[PDB]
């Protein structure tokens, strides 16, 4: 009854290493995609200076 409950509690509490590392990598890329586009988002307002002169 300890094995059957230890296994029962592990499924509820312990994390799946495979299904979590794969999900961590996804959000670790989605933040770099937003990081890359944030840099370009700041460059866009810089083009009105050539028009203002």
């Amino acid at each position: 009854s300890s094995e059957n409950l230890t296994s029962a509690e592990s499924r509820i509490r312990d994390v799946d290493m495979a299904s979590e590392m794969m999900e961590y990598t996804k959000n670790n890329i989605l933040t770099q995609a937003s990081q890359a586009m944030l840099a370009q988002a700041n460059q866009q307002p810089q083009q009105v200076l050539q028009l203002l002169k």
């Binding site: 094995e3 230890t6 296994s7 592990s10 312990d14 290493m17």
Partner: protein, 55 residues
């Protein structure tokens, strides 16, 4: 892959401490030469034996 608990190894441990116990019980009989060492091996066997030995 759950890491905090190894149910495969935890299950194997119980079977490990279940053939060791049986081997220990078997070696008690082999060393002493008696089926009934404790009274839990045969209650009626223990009772009949003592009457028999007494007789």
């Amino acid at each position: 892959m759950r890491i905090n608990h190894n149910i495969a190894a935890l299950n194997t441990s119980r079977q490990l401490n279940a053939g060791s116990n049986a081997a220990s019980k078997n070696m008690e009989k082999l060393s002493s030469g008696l089926r009934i060492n404790r009274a839990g091996d045969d209650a009626a066997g223990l009772a009949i034996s003592e009457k028999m030995r007494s007789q």
